[PDB]
Amino acid sequence: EDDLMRYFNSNSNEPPKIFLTTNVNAKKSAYEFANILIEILPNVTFVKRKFGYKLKEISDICIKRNFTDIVIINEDKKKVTGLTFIHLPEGPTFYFKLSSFVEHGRPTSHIPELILNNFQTRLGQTVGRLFQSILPQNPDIEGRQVITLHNQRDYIFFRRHRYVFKDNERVGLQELGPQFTLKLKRLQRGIKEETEWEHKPEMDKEKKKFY
Amino acid sequence: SDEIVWQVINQSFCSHRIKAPNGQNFCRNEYNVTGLCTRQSCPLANSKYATVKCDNGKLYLYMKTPERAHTPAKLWERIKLSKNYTKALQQIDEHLLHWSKFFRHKCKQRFTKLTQVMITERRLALREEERHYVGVAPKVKRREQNRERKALVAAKIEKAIEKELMDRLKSGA
Amino acid sequence: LPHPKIVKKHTKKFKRHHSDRYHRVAENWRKQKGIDSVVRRRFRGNISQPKIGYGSNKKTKFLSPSGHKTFLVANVKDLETLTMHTKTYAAEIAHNISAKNRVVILARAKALGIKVTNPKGRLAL
Amino acid sequence: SAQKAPKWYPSEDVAALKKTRKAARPQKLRASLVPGTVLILLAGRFRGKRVVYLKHLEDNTLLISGPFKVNGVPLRRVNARYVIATSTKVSVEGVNVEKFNVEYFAKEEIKAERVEDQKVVDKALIAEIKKTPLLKQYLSASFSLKNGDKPHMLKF
Amino acid sequence: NPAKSASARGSYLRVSFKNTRETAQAINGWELTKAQKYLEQVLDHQRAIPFRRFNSSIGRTAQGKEFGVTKARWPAKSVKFVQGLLQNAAANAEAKGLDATKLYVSHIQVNQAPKESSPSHIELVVTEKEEAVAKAA
RNA sequence: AUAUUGGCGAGAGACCGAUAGCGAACAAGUACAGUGAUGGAAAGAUGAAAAGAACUUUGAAAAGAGAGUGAAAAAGUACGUGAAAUUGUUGAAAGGGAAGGGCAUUUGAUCAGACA
């Protein structure tokens, strides 16, 4: 539980270095997408991935270079489609699906504050755990930037905003940063060897549950 | 005979032809050398017919003798073709002694391509690919469209943040 | 396979006369049968007609830009016909083939080295 | 089927090329290109530059130097047609240009050997440029076309 | 954003279509409080609706100078249907829990209905006008 | 033995597939028109199962927005699929007494492979 918090996920002890790579032979939109993750994630290095070094051979490099997490974005066609967060030692790994990206905010260099919604389910709070870990644990209050991760279904929406406080019990906020929708898949448990959940269409049949 | 077999399948049906838009004709009778079909390049019209095939990794060269026109059960006599390329082309040559120069270099040619089909192993040793083709069934395409549009409506993200900023900064005053 | 450079002679579509004027007249070509038509008597400034002079080069006829003749394929047994003719013909997976079977045909065509003209057909992730 | 297979098939056997009677002959350059001539380049990195002409190469190029000490043009290969050849000539006989060839320029920061070879050539060439007045100033400056210049009339 | 929106719709409404088109586009892109006040003024002949497309034999008036049009009319019945919908959309917004003051009609659309009669469908979608922003060095 | 476009009752089709096939697949010889003899239409399909939308809110109400049912309301009795004419909205572009068309290109939009 508390032992888990540290052993599988990154805590407020180090700066977490995130090895941002891309699926082989990707085009403009993937790097355009990498430029949006270059801002939001704490200490990203972009690695141009040049054919070979299967997966374990990568892990050997990021042990030596001493990274914490791997993130890989993929493209079937000209649109971005899938996002894969892996933790480098042990390997709790989360796969995701993007069906929304639309682009007037233009943010500062100040580091954004986190907020999460509706993770009653234990599988939900293990994903909430990932985004608590992978995003910065700095929040500088001033600069007034908020990153959300709302999950009212099995769909998770992340957005950025600017909050203005008036003393009459109300707060205003403007749209900023990338529009986004994610879907959880897999939880491969080993680096890529094992599964814990792996979405099927055998769900959607229930119309409920919500993991 | 065989001229009568040819004319009756040239027109009047060879019921395994593919008419390509190029006007080309392809016999899919598994035992032909050229995938295309023409006179004595398709294995029914011709009576003497050689071919290279593969059943496993073992590349055999099948051979059809006019002796066996009576019995279709044992038509194609077959011989294994070692595995090294140089001795195999030499192995080929001896079988094709005193035949048409058609089957001479064309079985040599079948063997060539089918050996460089064993570039499959090259693709399958250095596989380790993190992609794999996924179908997009149009039912799922709407279970994951019309439920996201129903999610956002019931989500009320603004009100959720408006709550959990006031509820935060009252307790963190 | 070594081919000449492709010269098309007429890149444009031979649209029917007054197909753009009226909606009931289809864009599909028909010859103006009437004796007093200025199209039939091929006047200056009137639409060009299909005639045999526009015939494509025989060595580069039916060829896609890559110098390949397109060949429709439904399944593995029909794809296996183009084993010997890899640099002449290229596979075209038929429109009605399911997403389950397209992955079978694409993997098999990769193995034999036969070129598929239409990948990404029903290959959504 | 779905396209019944054709009766005739075109042959798979690749045809051997017919014997070509096209024998390569060495390039006959124009008379204005004599080894040791002040050139003006037209296209490339060094457009509008005055340049010393040194050697005719094997791949129909021409080997030329600035010198690099004067105008910033090193030992370059150049095309014959991309070049203006003026009448002014410097002596070239004292330069050891004979060493390098086509194989010297194979590409597949800057190599030190290239800088050393440059300085060896450039010393033996300034040895001649220093003689005639203002020629070093003429090499340093860039060629252009002023308003009213007719290249068909400008006897270069 | 569907979260920042409310929408009313009237269907198979026995109104003149050609009048409804004009009074719909007259009110398009306006703040809700200004919009409802405007239609009250049209009812009392204070302001007139600018007629632009379906505008034959309309009496020329001075009140059209606001919109840069010579022709203008006071169509009581058509406006009556529209302010009924706007009152409905206002209550639809307060059902969801939107702000009333920052509300404006974004998409108002009117098209013909099955028929002789000449009935018409109307739909209008009201939206928040979101500003509320700050920065830090 | 032969005839048999009626009646009673079967069996069939290289026939038609809702502007076809009988006039009529259906409240069809019906609605209706004609003083009357007569003339005589149009009109098929929710879904596997009504599970035909409980409840909340807005409105005088029809209805609207939520919510729910269903595999799918992109199936809600105006219900299979839903073309074009014609219209609305949104985005781009053009427009000094016509427009659409051809040859060629700029510009803007958009797209195909090859680099497996």
XYZ file of C-alpha atoms in Angstrom, chain C:
125
model
C 10.371 -3.712 -62.931
C 11.989 -1.367 -65.560
C 9.261 0.607 -67.366
C 9.106 3.740 -69.591
C 7.917 7.085 -68.152
C 4.098 7.212 -68.259
C 2.522 9.686 -70.725
C -1.273 9.910 -70.357
C -2.192 12.171 -73.362
C -5.402 13.312 -71.641
C -5.379 13.694 -67.848
C -8.828 15.332 -67.779
C -12.231 13.615 -67.750
C -14.312 13.506 -70.948
C -17.530 14.993 -69.559
C -20.804 14.883 -71.520
C -21.983 18.058 -73.284
C -24.270 20.152 -71.033
C -23.628 17.817 -68.062
C -22.588 20.878 -66.037
C -25.610 22.911 -67.206
C -28.420 20.465 -66.331
C -28.589 18.134 -63.336
C -30.594 15.440 -65.180
C -27.774 15.049 -67.725
C -25.122 12.821 -66.128
C -21.395 13.583 -66.388
C -20.984 10.170 -68.087
C -19.883 10.473 -71.718
C -22.329 10.191 -74.620
C -21.762 11.097 -78.283
C -23.927 13.923 -79.674
C -26.033 12.096 -82.269
C -27.729 15.241 -83.683
C -26.570 16.603 -87.066
C -26.700 20.295 -86.050
C -24.635 19.925 -82.853
C -21.505 22.127 -82.713
C -19.865 19.451 -80.526
C -20.250 16.663 -83.127
C -18.802 18.942 -85.877
C -15.925 19.771 -83.452
C -15.936 23.597 -83.482
C -13.278 25.872 -81.966
C -13.790 26.264 -78.190
C -16.059 23.222 -77.732
C -15.369 20.212 -75.452
C -12.833 17.577 -76.538
C -14.119 14.077 -77.336
C -12.830 10.542 -76.736
C -11.089 9.294 -79.869
C -8.474 6.575 -80.476
C -5.601 9.088 -80.769
C -5.724 9.475 -76.984
C -4.769 5.780 -76.574
C -2.138 5.193 -73.891
C 1.298 3.662 -74.609
C 1.001 -0.132 -74.796
C 4.145 -0.701 -72.683
C 2.745 1.584 -69.935
C -0.983 0.761 -70.258
C -2.969 -0.368 -67.172
C 0.038 0.541 -64.976
C -0.194 2.384 -61.657
C 2.442 5.180 -61.093
C 4.832 2.566 -59.592
C 4.832 0.551 -62.853
C 2.521 -2.129 -61.452
C -0.658 -3.623 -62.930
C -3.359 -3.643 -60.225
C -4.891 -7.054 -59.476
C -7.962 -7.597 -57.293
C -7.610 -10.202 -54.568
C -10.257 -11.693 -52.261
C -8.242 -14.279 -50.295
C -4.907 -16.137 -49.819
C -5.482 -18.735 -52.591
C -5.988 -15.928 -55.151
C -3.014 -13.934 -53.787
C -0.768 -17.000 -54.124
C -1.169 -16.707 -57.933
C 1.158 -13.662 -57.989
C 4.070 -15.519 -56.338
C 6.140 -15.555 -59.543
C 5.002 -12.142 -60.869
C 5.889 -9.781 -57.987
C 7.345 -6.859 -59.993
C 4.651 -6.991 -62.708
C 1.396 -7.155 -60.703
C 0.438 -5.648 -57.355
C -2.386 -6.900 -55.119
C -5.606 -4.962 -54.513
C -7.661 -6.195 -51.550
C -11.351 -6.182 -52.571
C -13.720 -3.688 -50.908
C -15.966 -6.314 -49.309
C -13.215 -8.341 -47.532
C -13.591 -8.175 -43.731
C -11.098 -6.570 -41.319
C -10.420 -10.074 -39.920
C -9.273 -11.385 -43.330
C -7.375 -8.279 -44.518
C -4.732 -8.806 -41.804
C -4.332 -12.419 -43.070
C -3.807 -11.266 -46.696
C -1.409 -8.426 -45.717
C 0.828 -10.700 -43.595
C 0.908 -13.365 -46.337
C 1.723 -10.780 -49.053
C 4.581 -9.498 -46.858
C 5.929 -13.080 -46.668
C 5.865 -13.758 -50.442
C 6.918 -10.160 -51.229
C 3.821 -9.337 -53.295
C 2.995 -5.615 -53.093
C -0.416 -4.531 -51.742
C -1.683 -1.267 -53.282
C -4.202 -0.637 -50.466
C -2.968 -1.166 -46.921
C -4.608 0.985 -44.164
C -7.955 -0.358 -45.466
C -9.903 -1.340 -42.322
C -6.725 -1.051 -40.201
C -7.940 1.341 -37.476
C -6.266 1.222 -34.042
